[PDB]
Each structure stands twice: as C-alpha cells, then as structure tokens.
C-alpha cells in the first residue's frame, strides 16, 4: 500500500495545528498562545517547575538541538529523499534490463 | 513581529465601557444557564472548551497577583 | 501461549538454541555473581 | 542531593526503570515494504553501515554474532543519547545494568574459544616469541589481565557516562549561580556548557561503539 | 572526623591518576594526526586503532576515578 | 469511542481484559505511527514530540526529588 | 495574517474574568504581603 | 553512591536482559538488506539445431 | 581511628601509580597507528607486538592497583 505524501502539521516541532484550529472558534487566534503563557507563568510562578541547574543544561542542549535541526536538517532531508530515488532508478534500470533480455531470447 | 501588537490591541483589550452591559447580560445569561439545570444538557465539547477558558482567566489572575508583588517566582521577601 | 512462541520463539531459535550457548553459561556466572554480592550486604 | 539522577527512578510509588529501559527500541520501527519513510531509510542505511564496519574484520563463525553485536550497540547508543535529555534517568550509568550486559557476552566468548580452539586459546595465554627466563609468571599477568577483562568493560562505561552527566550538572549549578551576579560570566559559562554539552553527545555515541568493539575485539580473538 | 579527613585526602590522591590518561589520549589522537598527514587513505582503520587505544586509556581513567568514587562515597 | 459518547455505559462496555489492555496500547501505537512517522517525505517532529512526551514523563517521576529544592517557602 | 476574531463569549468571559482576575490578584497580593513582611522582619 | 543500593539491582538487570536480548534482536531481525538485483540481459543457451 | 585514615591515603598515593599505565598504553597505540599506516601489510605481526606491549603496560598498572587493594582491604 502506498505511503501519504506528508505528515501532521506540526507547529513548532511541538504542537500539532490540530490544537490551533481546535482552540480557535471558542478563543480565536491568540487563544492557544494567552492559554500557553499563562499556564507557563503559573507553573514557574507556584513553584511546580523549579528552576534549577537542570533549566540550565535544558536550554543548552535545547538551543544545541535547534540550531543542528535548522542547520543540517534539509541535507539529511533530500538525503534520505536522494537515497529512495536511487534505489528506484536502480530497480527500474533492473526491469528494463530483464525484459530486453527475453526479447533477445 | 509587528502583528503580535495587532493581535493584542484586536482581540485582548479590556471591555469598552459599552460593552459591560453585554457583559452583564451575558453573565445574567450562564448564570441563568447554571439556575435552570441547562449545564446538565451540555455535551463533553464546549463543557471542555469552557472549562480551558476558565483555566485561562485564572493564569490571568495568578498574573495579576504577581504583577502586584512586583515579582515572578514566589514572593520576594 | 500462542504468538508468544510464533513471533517471540522461532526467529530467536537458531540463535537462543546454537550461538548463545556460552552466552547463557556466562549468564549463570553473572546470576552467581550478583547473588554472591547482594548477599554480602 | 546531589546523586538523585542516579537514584532508581519510581513512580506513585511503581518501579517506573521498567519503562525507562524497554523504551529505546520503540524509537526503532521496523518495515516490509521496499520504500518506506526517511526513518526507516536512514535508520537502515546507518545500520547497514554500522554492521558493514564492526563484522567485516571477522570469519564466519565470528560473523553469526552480528545480529547480536549491532543490536548492542544500537541499544547502548540509543540509551546514553536518551540520557541527554533533561531530567532523564540514564540506565547506563548503573553498575548493575552495565555488568549484566558485559560478564555475559565476554564469559561467552572466553567460553566459545574455550570449547573449540582449546588448544589455541590456552596457547594465546602467552605470546608464543616470548624467551624463556620468564614465560611462567609472563602468563600470571596474562591470566590477571584476561579475568580483568570484563569489570573494566562495565566499568568503562559506568564512568564515563556518570561522571560526564555529574559534570554537566554541575556547570548547571554553576551559572545558576552566577545567574544573579554577573550577567557575561553567566553568558561564557553557558557557553562552556554549551560547547561541553556537544562533547557530551560525541561521547555517548563513543562509549556505545567502543563497548561494541572491545567484546568484537574478544569475539576474534576466540574465534 | 579524622576518617572524613582521610577519605578527603585519598580521593585527592587517587583522582590524581587520571593525569595519565588525559597524556596517553593526547599522545593517541596526535599520533592519529600524523599517521593520517602519511597516508590519508587507511582513515577507517587509523580511526578504528584510534578508538580502540582511547578506550584503554579510558579504562584507566576511569579505574582510577572510580577508586576515587569508591574510597570517597562508599567506603 | 470516545469524543463522540458522553455516557459512563462506554466505560461499562469496554473490555478490561490483560489482552483488552494490551490490544488498546497496541491500536494506539500504530495510529501514531501511521500517522506522523510512517508516511514518506515525513518530517522530524514525529520524533521530536515522542522525545518532549518522554522529558514530561521523567520530569514528573524526578519530581519528588526536586520539591525538596524550591526557592521559597510561602 | 488576516483577521480570524473572537468570538462572543470569548469577549464575556474574557474580559470580565479577565478584571476579576487582576483586581484579586492585587487583593491577594497585598494580602500575603503583610504577612510575609511580618515574617521577613521575624528572619532573625 | 546510589549504584550500590544492592537492593534495586534485579528491576536494573532483567528489564535490559529483555531489551537487549529479545526486543532489540527481533527489531533487527526484521531489518533485511535484499540482495541488488542483477538482471543479467545475457542469459540464453538454447543450442544449435542438431545440424 | 588513624590506621584506616592512614589505610585510605595509601590506597590513593598507590592508585596514583596507574597513570604510568595510561601513558604507556597511549603510547603503545599511538606508535601502532603510526607503524601500520607505515606499512599497512604487517598488520598481525604489528597488533601481536602490541598485545604484548599493552600486557606488559597492564601488569605493571594491575601491580599498582593490587597493591591499593593489598593495603587497602587486606593489610
């Protein structure tokens, strides 16, 4: 069976536009983004998340995972992408060849 | 970057004076909602999209408590 | 009792039944081992 | 206070390890078809290159480890990149976790070149050039080096994980710190971190390949 | 305690020993430098014999760190 | 299934066998596999939100040891 | 972006909870203050 | 340490046990490298005819 | 009391001796990347010399560690 052209619709790597167009008739569109920094200031704010040394070491390897993605994210792309094609080629220069074959015979 | 203030100055200003009344009314109105028994008749869609709305306006409020202590995390004393 | 020995069993027989032989003795010293050193505590 | 990333994990007061470890292979599907998604296809061309590089240097009775060999290192790198995250339990930096995978897969080796290769591999005890006036304690060291040879295996990994997370942890601690004193020593701070955490990342992968390679190195050695 | 005191000490001492690995990773990855400034062709088996060597230093290392760790936390 | 029923008889109608529990993870997994991994020209957040799942849940079991850290007291 | 606005009960709800949130959020504010200066002078 | 509470030690062994020698494996062993294919377009001895 | 004070501090003055070790096994690996990409056609005899080399380097750093261990757990 063949595979969808595409994935979700994913809106900062982290949320899905599902959420976006699911908050939007009852909030509009600032909604999911009023909704999202108040609940971020109420969770740094009662003391759920404590800012710590892991905060730090978060926003490090964050910051190393972001710029790797939006650096060497589209060459890993249209490798991936480069791979397949040559593999298909490869396999329709393989039918050709076969078929010729039996013709010759 | 320069539609972020569109959006806030469009959708989340502070009611007009005009619009407490319809503010008024429409509270007249869930309330009114809450004194029939007309809650009961709501399905799980909306009764959830209300409650994030509440959820909402209260991190507004928890907002509003640490814009008064001038401070973020706890109190600064 | 099904599917735990047709997906699980015969694809890990040649291995589990002819290479991993010395790979269990191993594993018995290792279970000695730890027994020996959670017993001395 | 300070060992708590290392401390067993629990959950509503469950043995929550369980999912820690069992997760790494649900980041690895798996397919029938011939062109599948770019993860599986870069998934199997890394795997592809990673057996190509570790099993080629061996006979056949050697290379029927090769599933065996690859799926170590694929789990042990999976797991200590999984590490990285923040507040993450990494189980490689527990002793137990580490000397289960390596008394078993090196006594299997010692033992397999044992059964065959008898009298080959109580010869190896001793480099055969080796002039008389001492081959008897030569082999002393040889016999102390090989029962060596599988607690520093676990070890050298149990460290090199442990200590590298401590380390990051602590320049953590460091620049919060100095989040309140001095904004541009915080910001080099930080960048120490940041460059440390991509030693970090190097590392990891490091540790699995070499793990790999040291019970590769047994292998065809008794074989 | 006196006890305290020396467990102190002895971590000092034995975290010294680390010294000779960071030498010996030195030396391997220089040596690494120049044989492939030789002959930039063996690159996989150059890099392999690199690993390989980086992780007996390794060991080492991390023998004695442990030492360190085990005199200090635990005993 | 859910979102469509708002009565507590689904909840009596769905099984709770250790094969009911098994069989509704393994329907799980495999709508979320195909829909944001197993689709070609895909993308990296079918990684990247099993990864930030995984961080909320090893924060929440490494929370007991972080109450005891709180800047401030109340 | 064009504009895609809110909705009724968003400007009901939203806005006067909205007030009622930041005017008990001042209440509230000044009223664990005074205690907690109490308490910040009872460091000692 | 914590890597010697020798009292947590099997819930760390055999969880990995599984993963290492019984999940992973069978994620490997359904990863195949089929062999390229070669269509070999010279593949023709009919004969002569007895003549 | 003072003997195991003075027991921890000679187990980490002995394990400092390890790192001689270290640096011996760097260098016995560095040279054998050096000398094959030298002469890539030795392979076996270089890696039998370094086998050797590095048991030689080991007995030494497990005479070092042993003796912690004498002094340490036994003496």
């Known amino acids: 069976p063949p595979l969808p052209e595409y994935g979700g619709k994913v809106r900062y790597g982290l949320i899905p536009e599902e959420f976006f167009q699911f908050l939007y008739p ?80 | 970057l320069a539609t972020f203030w569109y959006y806030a100055k469009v959708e989340l200003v502070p009611p007009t004076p005009a619009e407490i009344p319809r503010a008024i009314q429409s509270l007249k109105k869930i309330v009114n909602s809450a004194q029939t028994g007309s809650f009961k008749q709501l399905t799980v869609k909306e009764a959830v999209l209300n409650g994030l709305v509440a959820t909402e306006v209260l991190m507004w409020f928890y907002v509003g408590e640490i814009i008064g202590k001038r401070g973020i995390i706890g109190y600064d004393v | 009792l099904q599917s735990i020995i047709k997906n699980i069993w015969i694809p890990m027989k040649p291995y589990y039944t002819k290479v991993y032989q010395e790979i269990w003795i191993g594993m018995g010293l290792m279970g000695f081992i730890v027994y020996k050193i959670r017993a001395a505590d | 206070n300070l060992f708590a990333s290392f401390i067993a994990p629990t959950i509503l007061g469950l043995p929550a390890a369980v999912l820690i470890i069992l997760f790494p292979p649900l980041l690895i599907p798996t397919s029938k078809y011939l062109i599948n998604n770019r993860l599986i296809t870069t998934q199997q061309w890394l795997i592809k290159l990673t057996s190509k590089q570790m099993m080629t240097m061996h006979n056949t009775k050697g290379r029927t480890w090769s599933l065996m060999l690859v799926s170590l290192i694929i789990f042990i790198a999976t797991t200590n990149l999984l590490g990285l995250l923040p507040h993450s339990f990494t189980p490689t ?119 790999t390679l040291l019970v590769s190195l047994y292998l065809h050695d008794n074989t | 305690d006196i006890d305290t005191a020396a467990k102190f000490i002895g971590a000092g001492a034995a975290t010294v020993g680390v010294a000779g690995s960071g030498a010996g990773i030195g030396t391997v990855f220089g040596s690494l430098i120049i044989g492939y400034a030789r002959n930039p062709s063996l690159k996989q088996q150059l890099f392999s014999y690199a690993i390989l060597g980086f992780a007996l230093s390794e060991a080492m290392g991390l023998f004695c760190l442990m030492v360190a760790f085990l005199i200090l936390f635990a005993m | 299934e859910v979102k469509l029923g708002e009565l507590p008889s689904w909840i009596l109608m769905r099984d709770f066998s250790p094969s009911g529990i098994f069989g509704a993870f393994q329907r799980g997994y495999y709508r979320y596999y195909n829909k944001y991994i197993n689709v070609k020209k895909g993308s990296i957040s079918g990684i990247t939100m099993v990864l930030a799942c995984y961080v909320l849940f090893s924060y929440s079991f490494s929370y007991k040891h972080l109450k005891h850290e709180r800047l401030r007291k109340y | 972006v064009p504009p895609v606005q809110v909705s009724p009960l968003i400007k009901l709800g939203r806005y006067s909870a909205l007030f009622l949130g930041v005017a008990y959020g001042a209440t509230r504010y000044n009223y664990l203050k005074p205690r907690a200066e109490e308490e910040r002078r009872i460091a000692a | 340490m914590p890597q010697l509470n020798t009292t947590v030690w099997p819930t760390m062994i055999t969880p990995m046990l599984l993963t290492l020698f019984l999940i992973t494996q069978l994620k490997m062993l359904n990863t195949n490298y089929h062999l390229p294919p070669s269509p070999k377009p010279m593949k023709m001895k009919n004969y002569n005819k007895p003549w």
Do not use: C
């Open chain 4, 93 to 211: 930096t527990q002793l137990s976790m580490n000397l289960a995978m390596a008394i078993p897969l090196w006594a299997g080796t010692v033992i397999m070149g044992f059964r065959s290769k008898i009298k080959n591999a109580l010869a190896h005890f001793l480099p055969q050039g080796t002039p008389t006036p001492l081959i008897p304690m030569l082999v002393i060291i040889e016999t102390i080096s090989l029962l060596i040879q599988p607690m520093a295996l676990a070890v050298r990994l149990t460290a090199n994980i442990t200590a590298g997370h401590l380390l990051m942890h602590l320049i953590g601690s460091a620049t919060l710190a100095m989040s309140t004193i001095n904004l541009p020593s915080t910001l080099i701070i930080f960048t120490i971190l940041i460059l440390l955490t991509i030693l970090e990342i190097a590392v990891a992968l490091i540790q699995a390949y070499v793990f």
């Open chain 1, 26 to 105: 009852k909030t509009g569109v600032t909604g999911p983004y009023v909704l999202g920094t108040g609940l971020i200031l109420y969770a740094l704010s009662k003391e759920i998340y404590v800012i710590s040394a892991e905060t730090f070491t978060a926003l490090s390897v964050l910051g190393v995972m972001v710029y790797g993605i939006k650096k060497y994210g589209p060459f890993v792309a249209d490798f991936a992408d480069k791979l397949n094609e040559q593999k298909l080629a490869q396999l329709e220069e393989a039918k050709q060849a076969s078929i010729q074959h039996i013709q010759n015979a």
